[PDB]
Structures are given as C-alpha cells and as structure tokens.
Nucleic acid binder design. Structure first.
Lengths: 366, 227, 121, 122, 121
RNA sequence: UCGCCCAUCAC
RNA sequence: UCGCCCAUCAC
RNA sequence: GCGAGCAAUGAUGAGUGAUGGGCGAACUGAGCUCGAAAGAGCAAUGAUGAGUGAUGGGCGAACUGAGCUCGC
C-alpha cells in the first residue's frame, strides 16, 4: 500500500493504481535519513490519515522498522518490501514523478551522502570565526594573484582586462582558452559569454596591440590560472562549511555534567541566574539535605558535597580524591553556568579537559 | 605518443601504447577531470582515461578474456560496494550522458570522495547504506538493467540475489566477483565456487564463469541473466 | 576588551584602586580570587570590589557588576589579573579582589566610591 | 614580450611567497585551536602544511607521520608528549576535513612557487 | 511475558534444543552469553540460536528475533537463564547460546529447523 | 599471518 | 636510511 | 661452429612500484580479588588479557660496471 521515495511519499491499491502522494514539510535529506533508518515522519502521518479517511485499513509498508514505529504508535501496519506500490513506483517513475525525476533523486541523494557523518567539536564558534577570517584571507589572496595574472596576460592581449572585470570569468578565460590565437566564436559560448560580449573580444582578434608569448610562455600563465581555479573551489569548501557549522548551538552544563544532573542543580540554586551568580563554595553543597542542616543548626563538620555527589567522577570514586574533585568540580561548574547564562557560546570540552588534567594531577599527587 | 581505437564492447576503448602493447580505456565523461589520479590521455579534440588491470578486477577480467559484458551506453545500472572507483568509475564513462548509475556503499568513509566528482559526473548518484540489506536505500533507486558487486563480503551471494528481486527487470543481467576466503578459509576455492554456482543458479541463468589468475589469486568473476 | 564593563575609564581611578589594594592588605581586611570575592559580594560585606580587564574565559567574573547593582555596592576594573594577584601579595593571578575593611585607606576608598558613583549613573 | 615577463615572473614568485605566508598564517592560527605546540617547533611553513595534510586530526599522530616527513628524532622528543596535554582544545574529525583540504590546496601552492622558479631560470 | 517469545512453545523441541547445547559443548563449535551470541549471530554461518524465557530486562535479548529475520536463521527458547548456563557448562547464568558447528547435534538442528519453520507460518 | 575497496603519485 | 626484541617508569 | 656489430665519452637487469583512509578471514570468553585458610564478593546482562607517552640494554639490513645483439 505505502511506497517510500525521494519525490514525496506514495500510496497505491491492491491492483497497483495510485491513490495519493504527498511532498515533504522539512528538508528532504533529513526526512529520508529518518524514513530509511525506520522512524516515521509528519508528511507520512498525513498520508496514512488520508488513506484511513478514504476507507482503507490494510497498511502494508516496504520497511519492517518503519512499520514497527507505525504499529507501536497505534496504526494497522504490516511489511512487504516487494508490495505492489514499490513494484509500480520503482518500475516506472515516468507515470508518477515526471520525466526529469533523476534530477530530484540526484540533488537529495548526494546531500544525504554528504550529511551521514556526525559532528562534535569542543569550541565550534571559535573554530568557525577562523573560517570567517579564512573567507576574508581567501578573497584577499585571489584579489592579489589575479592582479599578477591581469598584468602579465595584458602583455599579450590587453583588450580583455576592462571587458571581463569580474575576476573568476577572467581566470576561466586564461585557464580554458589561454593563447590569444585560439579565440573563436564557439569557445566563448562554451565559456558562457553573451553575444553583446562576443562582438567585442572577436573585434580584437584581427587588430590587438599586445606583444607575443610563445607556446610554453603562455603555459606558466595557464598553470597560475589552473591553481587560482582551485582557490575558487577552496572558497566553495569554506562556503559549504559556513552554511553547515555556523548554525550550531549547544549548552555547556548539558555537556560538562550531563543534562539530567545539570537540570537538577539549576533548581537547588532556585535558578540558572543564581547558579551563574553564587560562589563555588555554595555551589559545592547545593541539596546536601540534612547534612547541611546539622552543619548550620547543630554545628557539625561541613558537608564535602551536595547533589554534585551524583557527578560520574565522584559517585563511584575512593575517599582520598572525592573531596578534592568536588571542590574543582564546583569551580568548573560555576564557570559553565556563567558561560550558558551571560555569553551563550560553547567551550564545554575545554572545561572538561581542565578538570581531567586536575583529576590526573590528583592521581599523580595521592 | 599513442594511437586510440574502439573495443569489442560499445563505450569501451583501447590505446596502442608507446611500449607496443594494447591497454584498455574510456572517453572521459567530461574532459579535464581526474578520478583516481590516473594516466589521462589527450587526443585530437577528445580526452581518454586508462582502466588499470594491475589494480582493477574488472580490467583484469577483460584482459583474462571475459566474453559477456552487459553494460552499454544509455542503460541503467546499480553498483554494490563502489567507493569511487579505480576499478568501478569507468561504468559512468561507458554508460555516458544519456544513462543512469546508482553507487551504493556500506564502508562509512570512502563514498565521501565520490561526492565531489558527481558535481560533473551527473549520471551517477552516490547513496550510503548496507548492500546486504536492499531496503537501506529504497527511496533513491529504481529497477535497473544491470547489477554489480566487487568487494566480496561474506554476504555477497545475498547482496546480488535479493537486490536482484527488488531492483532487476525481466530480461535483466548481473555480475559478481567471488572470493573463497569470505565464505570458507579452509576448503578449496573451486569447491567454494561450486557452492556459489549452485546457489546463483537457484535464481539466475548463469551465462559465464572466469578465474582471475594470473592477475589476482583465489578470486573469480561470474555473469548472470534474470529471464 | 571584555563584555561586562558598564562605563569607560582611563588609568584614572584604576591606578588609585590598585594603590588602595596595596595598603588595605596589611592595614585592614581583604580577600582575593573570585569565589571569595563572590562570598563577600553575595553576603554584601565587600565595601569595594576590584576586577581584571583580561580574564580568560571572560565569563567567570561577568556576574560581579550586575550583582553589585542588586546589593548596592561600588565596583571598578584594572588592566591585568597577574598584577592584581601581585598587588594582593600572592604569587599566582587573581580575576578579582574584595575590600571588607579599608584599614588606613578610608579617605581613599571613600574617594573611589564617590567618584565611581559619578559613573554608575 | 619575454624581457617584460622576466619582471612578471620575479614579482609572481614574491606574490606567491606572500600568499603562501598569508594562508599558512591562517592555517597556524586555526590549527592552534587543536594543537598549538607545532607553531614554535616547526618554523618551516611547508612542514606545518604537510603535517596538517598527512595527520588531519591531532589525536591520530604516531612516529611515521613525523619521521617520513623528515623531522629529526630531536623533534620527535616533542609533539608525541603533547597527545593529551597540548594547551589546545578539540576540533572534531568531521570539522577538521576543511582544514585537511586547506592544507592539500596550500601544498599545490608550493608546486606553483616551484613552477615559477622553473620559469625565472628560463 | 516478554515481547521476544513470539511463538507458543510446546512440551517438545525445547528439551531437544537444551540437548543440542549439551552435546555441541564438547563436539561442535559454540558460543555462550548474549554479546558473544550477537557477534556469532552476525558473523559467519551460525546454525541455531537458543534464548532463556526469564531474561529481565527483556530488551537485552529482544534484538535476537528481528536479527534472525534479516539473515534466514531459526531461533528457540528454554525455561531459565540458570539452566541455560548449566547446559553450556558454566556455574553462572546465560541469557543466550549460539551454534557455529553442531558436532553431534546436526540431526537435532535439522529436526528443530524443519518443525519450527512450519509452526510460525 | 592472509585478502578487498578507496584517493593521490611514480620507475 | 629504517625496523624488531627484551627490560623499565608516569597516567 | 666460426666470424661480425656496439661499448667505460657507459653494455646489462626490469610492466612494475610508492604515500595516504576504511572493511573482511567468527577479538579473548573465564577468570579475578580480598582472606591464616576452609571461605567470601564480583562475573557470559562479560572476569581477565589487548593502551598512549616516555626511560634503558640488545639485534639486523641488500646497485651492478660489461655485457648485450646477429648471420649460415
């Protein structure tokens, strides 16, 4: 009944005719990654509600675990990979998608394959600021090497410099066309120039004022244009990194102490504001219950730790180090709360590395 | 300094090399592209790329005299364990601008190097997922004319057979490079090749078998038809 | 330059507040480092607080200015945490220092408070 | 035009040397977020580039990637001891891909510097 | 009743799977415990796999049924993890056991596979 | 110990 | 120019 | 069988190799630790073994330089 595809999701009958198909309402590369690894999505929730409201119940899918999430959620779901929906839809897309269907397969398939690797840098906002300076320094080297390329090539064909002022189009001319007597009307259209630009350039083929480069003088100028082509590919490598990494956001406490312990500690302080105001000496003892009471009211020994005892390097650990680790944990915890509350940037794997150096030093000392 | 010529199969080419030997090649899908750092060959308005039989089972099998080659211009094909392809990428040149290639890979890194090459090799689509589990990529593929497997994983008989239930047409074909060690490391290679020959003939017409010595040892290549 | 500053200053007032640390330390009552500064800040008892301009990460002291509005006490900054630690007599650095009792320095801390109340405005 | 191309080839070598110094300053300042110990150990810019090409991710170091690059044993008695106690942080194996590619692009610029010296002679 | 015991087991074949473990123990090739079961259930040619009926949490062995449906292998179960450990010959427990070569058990594995394939159908 | 795919380059 | 074996310290 | 051509102002040998990144040939699979010692606690829902970095002693290692070619 269901069939599972890139150009939306599809429903077919027992005789192999179409019933309905629907297009996606999040980025299709993320919708395919869910549906391929067997968890169900909002546009398929709507297509199976359409199929239910039409008066069908026998919801055979292609995939076993997509069908698991469907019947675990409450639907009348079963599984057959060779079912008549997939046996029609994947045999002839022309009847359903249109003749250019392979463009839509291509543009999402390469994106899914570029996306199937997870990301966890330690201080990624700083590690993207360096790529914003790399974009400033990359246009800066392009705007230097192309000035040398202009001045050197204008010895041989100066009639081009003021006519192709956008630097990539001049580099592509000097890379791909190269020597001035190669220039004809067809190779300028194979370079993507318009008729208004091709009346000029060809105007100069019979009457240029430039002085001669020989066959392996023009070669080193072509080597320079072939390496500057890779600097435009490096600009794409930076543009494709910035479009992926500059959208990240992560909380620090959630990584330094783990989400459930962070969320608990924020409330024993009354709030995240208080956890970002209070001293480490107080953050050390938050929620110690009747051990803090008898330290104040009855004048007992101070508690070594409150709810920070649930920290995964204190809870299991031997006595010699539990107090020393609790003090340094309360300092590094007070820092992580101040970063999440005042700054909204991420450094949590640095804060871990420093507490990990202090724990190694505690072993090296005791 | 070479002479360029046509081969016995369409889309496949030969060069006469300066050493006085025949070497196998394809006409480059777009001219000026590099694909495995290879010896590219300029011609009189054309560009060609070598298909090296000293590091490619497909090229070595053609030099060992493989008879039945079903991949041709304009057709549709699926490759299982593709990475990018010193051995494999040449199917894109042979199928050309009018045909279709699906490249499936299980190996969690190498397909990342095919991803840039397809910004001009726009007849290929790369998809990451286990070739043993033909359901893993169901949304980005179709029925095809040909299926190929060349990495020789322990599952390889299931890799070709069950992909050929979902993805191979009536009057369709396939190819597989079988190695004995992935199924048993103790019994004879020609005996393991019988156990595969009797399972492969439990679903296909088996049209050819070839051993890959004196290039690569205890590996063989089979060719099949779906009726 | 850090985020947490609220008004601009030259070396004026700042060199005089560093000079006040250099005489409150052995004529009066003082604490050094930011968690002891924060104890004397939260429970009000710090009459003047001094913070560095070069804390790294900057965020560890970023509470001290707004918390000194919330309790109503004067605050000031100085150009280097190592030199503030050396003024507090210790051999490491200090991100902040707190005055509990000025000792001999009362007219000087009252000048600093009266001239900082020209800027917290 | 070749006597004028003497001037353009001499200026092109200093311009290529200036953009190599610029992109390697960017590579040094960026890779200092992952392994900053390298910046005063390796003053020779092409060895810093060849390190970031060949190693990529700073947690995957060994002797071979130093010894084959022609670092001395007097340089191998550093780098390796900084595996966990480098003053740097952590870039990811997935994020450092762009910095590995930046290093392979800059190694092509030493080939450009050499192609220009091959023409200065001519 | 756990989610992995997806077919009702009769007063027959269960004791034959217990016996197949007992006689493979010195004569076949065999693994015991669920992570070693898991790797010999993925890798090479397993012949049969056996589970206990009292595994708790059930989730640790709940992966074995769908893992047997992807790879064409039969599974069966026996009333206790402590008896399944004793059948493998260890004085602890075992949640599952896997057969790589049956040894003496080859006719028992053939009878179990034939009868279970037509039971579940 | 023994194989299979992968980019980039050579004598 | 490079590898291998044994003994040994810190975490 | 014998002669002929070339060569230290350079004969001979080799279609083969380098550098970088994963996967596959069923990781080990039950011991460990405390105790005077029987014993006790942990363990197949995983005992134990397999780390990285550094310090010290020992062991071993590979272009030739004249041959090549032939007619009957």
């Amino acid at each position: 009944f269901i069939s599972e595809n890139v150009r939306g999701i599809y429903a077919f009958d027992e005789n192999g005719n179409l019933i309905e198909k629907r297009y996606f309402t999040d980025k299709p590369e993320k919708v395919l990654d869910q549906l391929l690894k067997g968890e169900i999505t909002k546009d398929l929730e709507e297509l199976l509600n359409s199929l239910k409201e039409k008066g069908y119940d026998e919801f055979v899918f292609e995939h076993p675990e997509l069908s698991r999430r469907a019947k675990e959620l409450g639907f009348s779901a079963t599984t057959e990979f060779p079912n008549i929906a997939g046996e029609r839809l994947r045999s002839n897309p022309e009847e359903f998608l249109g003749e250019n269907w392979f463009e839509e397969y291509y543009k999402v398939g390469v994106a899914l394959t570029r996306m199937r690797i997870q990301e966890q840098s330690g201080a990624r906002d700083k590690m993207v600021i360096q790529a914003i300076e790399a974009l400033d320094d990359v246009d800066k080297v392009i705007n230097l090497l192309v000035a040398r390329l202009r001045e050197w090539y204008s010895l041989h064909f100066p009639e081009l410099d003021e006519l192709l002022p956008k630097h990539p189009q001049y580099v592509a001319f000097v890379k791909t066309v190269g020597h001035r007597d190669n220039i004809n009307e067809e190779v300028l259209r194979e370079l993507g120039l318009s008729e208004e630009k091709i009346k000029k350039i060809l105007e100069a083929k019979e009457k240029t004022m430039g002085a001669w480069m020989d066959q392996t003088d023009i070669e080193v100028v072509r080597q320079l244009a072939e390496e500057i082509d890779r600097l435009y590919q490096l600009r794409k490598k930076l543009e494709d990194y910035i479009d992926r990494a500059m959208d990240d956001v992560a909380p620090n406490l959630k990584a330094l102490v783990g989400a459930k312990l962070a969320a608990r500690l924020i409330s024993l302080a009354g709030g995240l504001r208080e956890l970002a105001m209070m001293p480490s000496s107080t953050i050390q003892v938050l929620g110690a219950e009747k051990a803090l009471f008898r330290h104040l009211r009855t004048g007992a020994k101070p508690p070594k730790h409150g709810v920070i005892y649930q920290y995964p390097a204190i809870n299991r650990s031997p006595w010699w180090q539990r107090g020393k680790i609790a003090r340094a944990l309360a300092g590094k915890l007070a820092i992580a709360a101040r970063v999440d509350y005042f700054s909204g940037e991420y450094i949590a794997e640095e804060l871990k590395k420093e507490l990990e150096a202090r724990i190694r030093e505690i072993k090296e000392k005791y | 300094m070479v002479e360029v010529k046509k081969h016995k199969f369409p889309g496949v080419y030969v060069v006469i090399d300066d050493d006085g030997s025949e070497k196998i090649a394809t006409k480059n899908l777009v001219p000026g592209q590099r694909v495995y750092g290879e010896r590219v060959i300029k011609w009189e308005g054309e560009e060609y790329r070598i298909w090296n039989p000293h590091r490619s089972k497909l090229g070595a099998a053609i030099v060992n005299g493989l008879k039945n080659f079903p991949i041709k211009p304009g057709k549709s094909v699926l490759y299982l364990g593709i990475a990018s392809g010193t051995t494999a990428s040449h199917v894109s040149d042979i199928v050309g601008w009018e045909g279709k290639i699906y490249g499936i890979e299980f190996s969690p890194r190498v397909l990342r190097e095919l991803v840039p090459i397809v910004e001009e090799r726009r007849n290929i689509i790369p998809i990451l997922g286990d070739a043993t589990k033909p359901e893993e990529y169901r949304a980005l593929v179709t029925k095809v004319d040909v299926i190929f497997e060349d990495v020789a994983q322990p599952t390889q008989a299931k890799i070709l057979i069950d992909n050929a239930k979902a993805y191979l047409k009536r009057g369709g074909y396939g190819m597989i490079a079988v190695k004995s060690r992935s199924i048993d490391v103790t019994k004879e290679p020609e005996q393991v090749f019988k156990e595969v020959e009797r399972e492969l003939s439990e679903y296909f017409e088996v049209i050819e078998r070839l051993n890959l010595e004196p290039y690569e040892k205890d590996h063989a290549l089979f060719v099949v038809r779906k009726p | 330059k850090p985020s947490y500053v609220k008004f601009e200053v030259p070396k004026e007032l700042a060199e005089k507040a560093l000079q006040a640390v250099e005489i409150a330390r052995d004529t009066g009552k003082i604490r050094k480092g930011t968690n002891e500064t924060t104890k004397a800040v939260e429970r009000g008892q710090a009459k003047l607080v001094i913070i560095a301009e070069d804390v790294d990460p900057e965020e560890i002291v970023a509470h001290l200015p707004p918390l000194c509005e919330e309790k109503e006490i004067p605050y000031i900054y100085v150009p280097s945490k190592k030199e503030l630690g050396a003024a507090a007599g210790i051999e490491v650095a200090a991100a902040s220092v707190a005055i509990i009792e000025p000792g001999k320095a009362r007219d000087l801390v009252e000048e600093i408070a009266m001239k900082v109340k020209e800027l917290m405005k």
